Design a binder for this molecule. Sequence first.
Ligand SMILES: O=C(Nc1ncnc2sc3c(c12)CCCC3)c1ccccc1Br
Length: 469
Amino acid sequence: GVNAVHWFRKGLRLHDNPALKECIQGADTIRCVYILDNVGINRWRFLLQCLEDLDANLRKLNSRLFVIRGQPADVFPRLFKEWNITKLSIEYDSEPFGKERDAAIKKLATEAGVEVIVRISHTLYDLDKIIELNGGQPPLTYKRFQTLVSKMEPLEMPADTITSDVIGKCMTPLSDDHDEKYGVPSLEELGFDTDGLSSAVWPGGETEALTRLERHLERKAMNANSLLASPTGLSPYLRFGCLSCRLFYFKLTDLYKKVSPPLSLYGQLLWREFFYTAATNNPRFDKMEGNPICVQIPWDKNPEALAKWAEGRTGFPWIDAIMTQLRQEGWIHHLARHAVACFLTRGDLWISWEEGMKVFEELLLDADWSINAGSWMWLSCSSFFQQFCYCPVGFGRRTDPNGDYIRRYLPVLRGFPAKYIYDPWNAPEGIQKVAKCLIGVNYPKPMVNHAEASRLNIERMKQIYQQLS
Ligand SMILES: O=C(Nc1ncnc2sc3c(c12)CCCC3)c1ccccc1Br
């Protein structure tokens, strides 16, 4: 009869999944597949927990998740024959590399005779309609984007959650060896080293996401504490699709009327849509050269300075603590991202924003390709009509004067008083000795003179924008 596959990539959830809902209709069998292809261990652990949660939720419906390793263009032809498939569904991917992959798979599926169901559910709106309304090009200012959104039609209701009623007569063929053939692998099974690993600060999955949403909405009814990961934080769940942006939007509206909302209510989701809209028609969005919206800047090439930044060994505790929290947990505060991005690019190291993007792509759980690239251009003054220097000592000191953020992520500095915790090289030798941390030995000296470096770099950027004008 009619055998369907729903292909999970993003949208790792059973709620608000219109592609999966439409795939199930009229189908006699359904199989949900995830296909495993610069990704760090925290990202992999989050994804694997998403799949684990997906699998457990499908088992409640007497189904399972099918995890396959391979290239989709190799794998789907085999699957189409093995399972006699005539129906394939995906959530639409607006990002240019995902667009490219999906057009190839659609071609393969058509040749095989498989119909392809594509549904928008990872963004609030159809990005093509926003671009058409703005005249064929995405807006490069948030204000114009807000003007476009406010003209759009009201958001339709989120798709019905995949339940037993929705499934109807559809079923999943099961085998007793399913885990051996198609199980969700562990990190070690992928070859990752997990010896140092601690329990995840950000456990993946739709169940965690929906639990966090309820608690977030109840609570809603920077500062030193806000630097720490929040139990009600939602951005990794949005990036992976564990939490629908449309469901979040609808819950926010509901909360507002219980307590004509302004768009700033939806600012977290709208800012995400903005960068997705900017990226979708730009295949060079993640590059400087050949990118039509990116200012050409002669960035320095310095692998050693780049490695010090990436690994949190700059000798600036504020910067190093942030980069350490990012590496250990996969999330840092919005304003912390400003601090380290400025240090790497226009502020201190004059290193290309492309290098920062690569590091965040490995480490940052909530950093979608479109948002990561757009953000690094934004904060390096390379696009979005942006023309701007954070201080790598003062910024931390003002935000967490007692320095407990530093002591949490750089324990070698714990003995230092608050007076020197953000600039330990200024501490007298006796204080360094009773803290048992000599600067330049147990913790590195500052890699750059900030005042000299920032002053020169401000001049360089000013010359760039004088050349532009
Ligand atoms: O987290 C980031 N970016 C945002 N993520 C969500 N919402 C928003 S609004 C907004 C930004 C943003 C960044 C630029 C200013 C306005 C980020 C920052 C630096 C490097 C990579 C990333 Br992935």
